[model samples]
Structures are given as structure tokens and as C-alpha cells.
Target: APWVTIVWDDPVNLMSYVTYVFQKLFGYSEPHATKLMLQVHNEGKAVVSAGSRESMEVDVSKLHAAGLWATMQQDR
Candidate 1:
């Protein structure tokens, strides 16, 4: 199964910072990053990236290092 990276909303992170991180790490455009950030804010979580298991793991680690709550799982 393909792996997916999910980001969870947290009280510690500001919206602007989250948006910037999405752009910096994933190369998301401003509007796309903003849209994902809003989903995270309203839904409590959002699937941010997908790839092979190894890649998803690396993405999750990067997000964690950036202080965002993140996890990875195989796509169903």
C-alpha cells in the first residue's frame, strides 16, 4: 500500500507557521498551503503527503522536527 503523511492541529502552532511549513517542505503554493491549513484547523487533521513508505516516514520526521504533530500510515 502507498503510505500517507497526516498532520494534526495543535495548540502550539500558529496558522501562519503551519502554512509556511507546508510550503517549505512540500512545495505547496500559497493558496494550497492556506487551504490545507484551514482544513487542519477546522477538521483537526489533514493528509498532507503520500508516497512510498520510506518517503512518508521521512516526511513525517521532518514535520515532527518542525514541531508539527504528524504521523504516517498505509493508505487503505
Candidate 2:
């Protein structure tokens, strides 16, 4: 099983800024970043990445450091 990093939407972060952060932090393409950003905006959260538990933990930590609301969970 994999683990995923979820980025949750918050009242503090702007939508456009979230999109930018996605791109800058993950090196995601603009379209991909925008897609995840929109999911977080509309759905209140999005699974931004999937990998091993260690990788997901690191990703979650990075997002947290960047002031994004993030968490990791094992994939069902």
C-alpha cells in the first residue's frame, strides 16, 4: 500500500498562492498544480502526492513548513 499527502484548504491561504506553492514545492506543472489547487479549494482538501510512508511524511512536513495545512495517511 502507498501513503498519500493531503493538503487541506484553509481560510488563510489564497487559491492562487496555493497553486503557486504546489508548483514551486513539488515541481508540478502549472496545469497539474492548478488542478490540485482547485480540488482543495472546492472540496476542502486534495491528495497532493502518493508514495511510501516516509516520503509522504517528508512531503507533509514540507507543506507544513510552508504554512500549508497537510497530513499523511496510508492509502486504503
Candidate 3:
């Protein structure tokens, strides 16, 4: 089964920086990155990507290294 990596809202990270990280780390296009970042800001969380468990784990680790609150779970 596929897994998803979610970036959760936190007071520490700036919204724009979060968007940038999504773009930089995941290679998301600007619009796509901003859309996910907005969801995280407005809704308090967003599933940033879905894929294999290993890939999701790498994404989660990278987000953590970037100082963003994140986690991974099996896609429903």
C-alpha cells in the first residue's frame, strides 16, 4: 500500500518558507507547493505526497531536517 507524508501546522515555521521547502525538497511546482502550504496553514495540516513507504519515510525525514513538523501514515 502507498503511504502519505503530512506536513502539520506549527507556529515556528513561516508559511512562505514551508511552501519553499515543499518545492525545494520535493520538487513540487510553485503553485502546487503553495496550495499544499496553504492547506497546512488554513486547515492545520496537509498530505504533501503519497508513495512507497521508503519514499514517504525519506520525505518525512527531510521535512524534519528542514524544521517542519511532519509524519507519515498508510494512505486510506
Candidate 4:
């Protein structure tokens, strides 16, 4: 199975910044980014990316560098 990058909800990051990170990192449209941000906000986490283990690792690292809490695991 592919690896998945999951972004976790946290108290530190602003909602708008999270939305922007989603847009900048994933190339998501504003609406899509907002949706994912809201999912992270309301649902406590969201799967932000899926791919090979290496790619998902890179994504998790990027999100962390961006000051977001994230993790990776093999997709079920």
C-alpha cells in the first residue's frame, strides 16, 4: 500500500496559514485548501498526501518545517 501523510490539528497554527500551506505545498485551490484545513480543524486530522514512502516522508518533513504537526503511515 502507498504511504499517506496526515496533518494533525494543533492550537498553534492559524487557520488561514494552514490553508495557505495546503495551497502552497499541495497546489490545492483556495477552496480545496480551506476544506482540508477545516477538516484538520474540526476532525482533528486530515490525510494530506498519498504516495510512495519516500514522497510521503518528504511531505511530512515539509509540513513539519512549516510548523505543522504531521505523520506518515502505510495506507490501509
Candidate 5:
């Protein structure tokens, strides 16, 4: 099954930093990355990415190393 990478809100990461990481990691535009970061800030979490399980795991690992919270799960 396909999988998704979820990003969660955290007290440590600055919103701007999260946006930057989004673009750096996922190649999202500034506005799009900020949009996702806002969701993680205002809504508590967001589905930041989706793809193969192996890739998703790497994404989670990278996000975690970036000082952001993340998890992976099979997509619906």
C-alpha cells in the first residue's frame, strides 16, 4: 500500500523553519510550504507527503532529524 508522511506541531520548531524544511525536503514552493506549516501550527498536524512506504520512512527520518515531529502510515 502507498503511505503518507505526517508532520505534527511542536514547541521547538519555528514556523518559518518548518516552511523552509518543507521546501528543502519536498521541493514545495514557499507559499505551499507555509500553507502546510500553518496547518501543523493551527490544526495540530498535517499530512505533509505521500508515496511509497520506504520513501515515507526516509521522509519521517529526515523530518525527525530536522527537529520536527513526524510519523508514517498507510494511506487510505
Candidate 6:
């Protein structure tokens, strides 16, 4: 099974920064990144990426380093 990287909502980070981070790291457009950020804000979390286990872990690490809450999980 593949793995997924999930980003969770938190009080510390700015929504705009989260969107920028998504754009920088994932090459997501502003609209797409903002949509994901909104999903996290409204739904508590969003699956930011899906790939191999190692890749998802890397993505989670990068997101955490950016000061965003993140985790990796096995895809069903």
C-alpha cells in the first residue's frame, strides 16, 4: 500500500503561510494550496500527499519543519 501525508490544523501558523509552504514544497498553485489549507482548518486535517512510505515520511518531516502539524499513514 502507498502512504499519505496528512496536514492538521493548528493555532500557531498563518493560513497564508500554510498556503505558501504547500506551494513551495508541493508546487501546488495558490488556489489548490489554499483549498487544502482551508480543508485542514475546517475539517481538522487534509491529506496533503500520497506516495511511497519514505516519500510520505519526507513530506511529513518537511511540513513539521515548516512549523505545520503533519503525519504519515498507510493508505487503505
Write down the lDDT of every candidate, Cα atoms only. 0.96, 0.93, 0.94, 0.95, 0.95, 0.93
Predicted candidate 1 versus true structure: per-residue lDDT over 1-76, tens digit per residue: 7999999999889999999999999999999999999999999999999999999999999999999999999999
Clashing pairs in 2: none
> 1 or 6, which is superior by lDDT?
1
Candidate 3: where is the Cα deviation over 4 Å? none
- For model 2, residues 20-46, the per-residue Cα lDDT tens digits are 899988999999999999999899999
Q: Which stretches of candidate 6 lie over 4 Å from their true place?
A: none
Each candidate: RMSD to true structure?
0.6, 0.7, 0.6, 0.7, 0.6, 0.6
TM-score of model number 6: 0.96
Candidates in order, TM-scores: namely 0.97, 0.95, 0.96, 0.96, 0.96, 0.96
Give lDDT tens digits, candidate 3, residues 1-76.
Answer: 9999998999888888998999999999999999999999999999999999999999999999999999999998
> Quick one: how many clashes does candidate 4 have?
0
Give lDDT: candidate 6, residue 36. Answer: 98
Q: Which pairs clash inside model 4?
A: none
- Where is model 2 more than 4 Å wrong at Cα? none
Q: Is candidate 2 or candidate 5 better by TM-score?
A: 5
What local lDDT does model 4 show for residue 20? 97
